[PDB]
Design a protein around this nucleic acid. Structure first.
Ligand code: SAH
Length: 327
DNA sequence: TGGATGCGCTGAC
DNA sequence: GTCAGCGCATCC
């Protein structure tokens, strides 16, 4: 993540729905916001959350009375995506996990915050012939909010990862916010290579598979793009190797394959998957962030998480707007 | 709501 | 035909 000298969100309270690792909290708190509530039902996620912010998130959002939720200015919710993901079976709102946005909606209807900051995968924007994005949109509008949604690739904001996600920013209409803009992209100057830990700390992650079929030659110059170099097995998910001279591929939560959840990489003549700390770094997390003691759980958490930096800029712009109160 | 991993197949070139 | 995906299925 980056530092924010002008705390645009000072004075604003927010809530961390579907908390996870607390990505939205890190991003918003870096702008001065104060977290007044967090909700997450996963045990292990609650542990690492607690481990980094003290409090333990409340459970099942569907069993919480919106009226219980403390008052706030911004609602942060990066709801589930398996049901909207391109690799999932896209059952959408017909997935027991695809209806969480309606819980978010019933919390907004009641707590009427100034802003609703949401995040879900890229395929969410075009899922079910863009009918899904529209529901989320028309729902928000019906709730008397403006709907600003765009798909942003982390690689365009300083993080070497091709993580495309839809960010939906909503302002309560009485605020008449008319100048919100998504961060403008910039040149990437960091790649997988710059975030790796010393070889001495990742030998265990080394994978020597007799069925490695190096499909391409390693690249000399860095690039703001994923560069596949080889394959293991049938080269499905978790069976692809990339150049550390490029950017990393999207981290996943339930990912399989031998290079499960992070993908494989060619590092100093050897092939291995990323280490939890490297997953943190590739997600914009500061090295001060305490990752979960269970590496499997930690991989699942970073795969489900968000790229802080991207959230930071969007957050800076949300406040930058809220603050424009000319006479 | 455990950990590991082989795989299907849809989406946007 | 290419290739990447906050995933899914099945095993211990
Ligand atoms: N009914 C429910 N109640 C509370 N949390 C839920 C939930 N259903 C799913 N979740 C949580 O929703 C999260 C979605 S992934 C979001 C992660 C978050 N942005 C962070 O930065 O990492 C998961 O951690 C999942 O356990």
């Amino acid at each position: 993540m980056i530092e924010i000298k002008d705390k645009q969100l000072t004075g604003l309270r927010f809530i961390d729905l579907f908390a996870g690792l607390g990505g939205f909290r890190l991003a918003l708190e870096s702008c001065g916001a104060e977290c007044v509530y967090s909700n997450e039902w996963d045990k292990y996620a609650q542990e690492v959350y607690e481990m980094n912010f003290g409090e333990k998130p409340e459970g099942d959002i569907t069993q919480v009375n919106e009226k219980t939720i403390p008052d706030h200015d911004i609602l942060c919710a990066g709801f589930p995506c398996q049901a909207f993901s391109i690799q999932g079976k896209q059952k959408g709102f017909e997935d027991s996990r695809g209806t969480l946005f309606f819980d978010i909606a019933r919390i907004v209807r009641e707590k009427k915050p100034k802003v609703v900051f949401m995040e879900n995968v890229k395929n969410f924007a075009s899922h079910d012939n863009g009918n899904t994005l529209e529901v989320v949109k028309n729902t928000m509008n019906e709730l008397d909010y403006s709907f600003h949604a765009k798909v942003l690739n982390a690689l365009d904001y300083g993080i070497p990862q091709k993580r495309e996600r839809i960010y939906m920013i909503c302002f309560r209409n009485d605020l008449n916010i008319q100048n919100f803009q998504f961060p403008k992209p910039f040149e990437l100057n960091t790649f997988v290579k710059d975030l790796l830990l010393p070889d001495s700390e990742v030998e265990h992650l080394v994978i020597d598979r007799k069925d490695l079929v190096m499909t391409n030659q390693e690249i000399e110059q860095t690039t703001p793009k994923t560069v596949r170099l080889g394959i293991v097995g049938k080269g499905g998910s978790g069976e692809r190797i990339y150049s550390t001279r490029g950017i990393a591929i999207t981290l996943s939560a339930y990912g399989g394959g031998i290079f499960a959840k992070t993908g494989g990489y060619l590092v100093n003549g050897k092939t291995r998957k990323l280490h939890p700390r490297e997953c943190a770094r590739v997600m914009g997390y500061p090295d001060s962030y305490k990752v979960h003691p269970s590496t499997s759980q930690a991989y699942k958490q970073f795969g489900n998480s968000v790229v802080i930096n991207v959230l930071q800029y969007i957050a800076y712009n949300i406040g930058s707007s809220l603050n424009f109160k000319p006479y």
